[PDB]
C-alpha cells in the first residue's frame, strides 16, 4: 500500500492574472512536480486568494492516454482534486489544472 501526498494550490493575482504557487505539507514552496515510487494518491487543495471564485473542474492532459495517471477525482465544492496513480506505467506526464471562475465564463488553466 502506498503514499498519500498533499499539495496546496495557492492562487494569487498578479498583473490581474492568476499565479499558482504550490506548497508542501511542511509549508514550503515547491515546483509542483512529483515522483511516484509506488501506487498512491496526490491530493491537491485549492487556496484561492484571487477573489475570483475559482473552483477545480478537472485536471487536463495533452497526453491523456499515456497511462501515467489512472484517474482524477474531484469534490463537490471544487476545492479538492485527487489523482490516482497506480504506478504500473513508467514515464512522465505533464498536466494542468482546469478551473471555473465567477468573473466570467472562460476556464482557467494553470501553466503548461
Amino acid at each position: 500500500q502506498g503514499l498519500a501526498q498533499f499539495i496546496k494550490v495557492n492562487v494569487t493575482l498578479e498583473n490581474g492574472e492568476p499565479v499558482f504557487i504550490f506548497t508542501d505539507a511542511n509549508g514550503q514552496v515547491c515546483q509542483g512536480d512529483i515522483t511516484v515510487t509506488q501506487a498512491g494518491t496526490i491530493t491537491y487543495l485549492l487556496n484561492d486568494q484571487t477573489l475570483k471564485g475559482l473552483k477545480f473542474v478537472g485536471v487536463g492532459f495533452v497526453t491523456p492516454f499515456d497511462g501515467i495517471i489512472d484517474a482524477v477525482t474531484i469534490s463537490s465544492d471544487g476545492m479538492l482534486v485527487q489523482l490516482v496513480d497506480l504506478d504500473k506505467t513508467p514515464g512522465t506526464t505533464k498536466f494542468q489544472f482546469v478551473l471555473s471562475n465567477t468573473a466570467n465564463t472562460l476556464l482557467v488553466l494553470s501553466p503548461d
Partner: peptide
C-alpha cells in the same frame, strides 16, 4: 506540473 512514474 509534471508527474514521473517509477514502479
Amino acid at each position: 506540473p509534471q508527474i514521473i512514474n517509477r514502479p
